[PDB]
């Protein structure tokens, strides 16, 4: 009877997820370790309540992994999660929501992994797109949000060694606090890559709009986290906003949760398989006598590499999904987001030959 407690935390999600009450210890998809899954649906959605709720839970019950989803647009959630994964040397998966928005810096000791694309993959795709439509002259505009440095580099890198005639005209760096205007006015290019948070973005646009740089002639392309919840669209978001997004259509929540439990339950089974051990439950986020810093690294070798049934879920070093299915989307005229492209693996399939006008 090899068990492993898993917490499924669902902050703000509509309760459409139903987990087997674990009476009959029937095994999960024929894996050696039975996951004892504890469901939890927090109502309050502020980070404070989450840190409290997750932590309390970890001392009360015997948890050796956390699958965590939220329907909020708070990248904040990611900090609290990386922190906990670190303090407790426990794997925590950022399955969806703010909890999975690119966290650039990340405690290299933590086991916080996020679903969806890395800052790099996303950059590599935004260029992948600009080619399909021979959009070669462009400016970058980032804020100070962690990642900006890593993002700009990925662009500059792929540019340098490319036969294609890329012209990176400007790169801005916005000290938010409206001195932005004097900066954003200096923009010439037609294509603009804007790297920042959703909330930062809405200010940045409100400004550009009353400077014209947002309209016809200018198309803005933007990372997955600025789209955020596609159901919430700022007034200031320009129609004709291109964005990369994780795929919330063919990939429902319950499928991720399944995948979450799978990732962990596999790693655990493959460790019990190679060493008669599964790391005891750590029971404090704070009071840390759990200097068990070694059995961690071992687990971490198995989590990082799961492939389950059809899907491949192996993770990158910086804790992003290595092979995510992406969707390019477009802020239309009626102000919804349309699907207008897919990305499989280095394979960018678009829907239109003539790029639409909104």
Ligand X SMILES: *[C@H]1O[C@H](CO)[C@@H](O)[C@H](O)[C@H]1NC(C)=O
Which residues carry a binding-site annotation for Zn(2+)? 96, 248
Residue 72 binds: one of Na ion, ligand X, Cl ion, none (C-beta under 5 to 8 A by kind): Cl ion
> In terms of Cα–Cα distance, which of 155, 91, 15, 136 is closest to 301?
91
Residue 56 binds: one of ligand X, Na ion, Zn ion, none (C-beta under 5 to 8 A by kind): none
35 in contact with Na ion (CB under 5 A): no
Residue 323 binds: one of Zn ion, Cl ion, Na ion, none (C-beta under 5 to 8 A by kind): Zn ion
**Minimum distance of Zn ion from residue 184's CB (angstroms):** 30
The nearer residue to Cl ion, 58 or 95, going by C-beta atoms, is: 95
Residue from 2, 41, 56, 149 that binds Cl ion (CB under 5 A)?
A: 149
d(CA 53, CA 27): 28
d(CA 96, CA 111): 16
d(CA 320, CA 280): 26
Encoded one letter per residue, x for contact with ligand X by CB under 6 A and - for no contact, window 31-50 reads ------------xx------
Residue from 2, 20, 29, 211 that binds Zn ion (CB under 5 A)?
A: 29
305 in contact with ligand X (CB under 6 A): yes
What is the enclosing helix (H) or strand (E) of 59? helix 47-60
Cβ atoms 78, 94 nearer than 8 A: yes
Cβ atoms 37, 274 nearer than 8 A: no
Give the N- to C-terminal CA distance of the chain in Å, as an integer.
59
Phi-psi region of 244 (alpha: psi -120 to 50; beta: other; left: phi over 0): beta
Compute how many other C-beta atoms are within 10 angstroms of the C-beta atom of residue 337. 18
d(CA 236, CA 36): 46
214 in contact with Cl ion (CB under 5 A): no
**Minimum distance of ligand X from residue 292's CB (angstroms):** 24
d(CA 297, CA 82): 16
Residue from 27, 46, 107, 132 that binds Zn ion (CB under 5 A)?
A: 132
Residue from 164, 307, 336, 339 that binds ligand X (CB under 6 A)?
A: 307
Residue from 100, 214, 269, 296 that binds Na ion (CB under 5 A)?
A: 100
> In terms of Cα–Cα distance, which of 163, 69, 52 is closest to 114?
69
d(CA 287, CA 284): 6
Q: Which stretch binds Zn ion (CB under 5 A): 32-40, 117-125, 136-144, 274-282?
A: 274-282
For residue 98, the 8-state DSSP code is G
The nearer residue to ligand X, 43 or 188, going by C-beta atoms, is: 43
Residue from 44, 131, 167, 280 that binds Zn ion (CB under 5 A)?
A: 131
Residues 112-141 interacting with Na ion (rule: CB under 5 A): 114, 116
Q: Which stretch binds Na ion (CB under 5 A): 52-60, 61-69, 108-116, 332-340?
A: 108-116
Please state the length of the chain: 358
Strands 241-246 and 326-331: antiparallel
**Minimum distance of Cl ion from residue 89's CB (angstroms):** 25
Residues that bind Na ion (CB under 5 A): 100, 114, 116
Q: Which residues bind Zn ion (CB under 5 A)?
A: 29, 131-132, 248, 275, 323, 345
Interface with Cl ion by CB under 5 A: which residues?
A: 72-73, 101-102, 149-150, 224-225, 258, 339, 342, 351
**Interacting residues with ligand X (CB under 6 A):** 43-44, 305, 307
């Amino acid at each position: 009877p090899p068990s492993i407690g898993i917490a499924v935390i669902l902050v703000g999600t509509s309760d459409e997820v139903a987990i087997k009450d674990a009476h009959e210890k029937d095994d999960f998809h024929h894996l050696s370790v039975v996951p004892r899954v504890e469901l939890v649906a927090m109502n309050e959605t502020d980070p404070k309540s989450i840190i409290t709720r997750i932590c309390d839970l970890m001392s009360d019950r015997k948890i050796q992994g956390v699958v965590f989803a939220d329907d909020t647009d708070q990248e904040a959630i990611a900090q609290i999660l990386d922190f906990i994964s670190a303090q407790t040397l426990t794997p925590i998966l950022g399955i969806h929501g703010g909890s999975s928005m690119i966290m650039a810096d990340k405690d290299e000791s933590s086991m916080f992994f996020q679903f969806g694309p890395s800052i790099e993959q996303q950059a590599s795709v935004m260029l992948n797109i600009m080619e399909e439509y021979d959009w070669y002259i462009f400016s970058i505009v980032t804020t100070y949000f962690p990642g900006y440095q890593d993002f700009v580099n990925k662009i500059r890198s792929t540019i340098e060694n490319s036969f294609v005639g890329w012209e990176l005209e400007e790169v801005l760096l916005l000290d938010m606090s409206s001195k932005i205007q004097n900066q954003l006015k200096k923009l010439q290019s037609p294509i603009i890559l804007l790297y920042c948070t959703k909330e930062e973005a809405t200010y940045i646009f409100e400004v550009a709009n009353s400077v014209g740089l947002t309209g016809y002639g200018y198309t803005w392309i933007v990372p997955s986290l600025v789209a955020g919840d596609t159901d919430t669209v700022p007034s200031e978001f320009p129609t004709g906003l291109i964005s990369v997004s994780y795929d919330e259509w063919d990939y429902g929540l319950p499928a991720r949760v399944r995948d979450g439990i799978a990732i962990i339950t596999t790693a655990a089974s493959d460790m019990l398989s190679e060493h008669s051990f599964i790391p005891e439950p750590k029971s404090s986020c704070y009071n840390t006598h759990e200097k068990r810093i070694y059995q961690s690294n071992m687990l971490n070798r198995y989590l990082i590499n799961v492939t389950f049934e059809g899907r491949d879920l192996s993770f990158s070093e910086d804790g992003y999904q290595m092979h995510p299915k992406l969707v390019i989307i477009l802020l239309n005229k009626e102000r919804k987001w349309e699907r207008v492209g897919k990305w499989k693996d280095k394979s960018l399939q678009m829907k239109y030959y003539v790029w639409p006008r909104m």
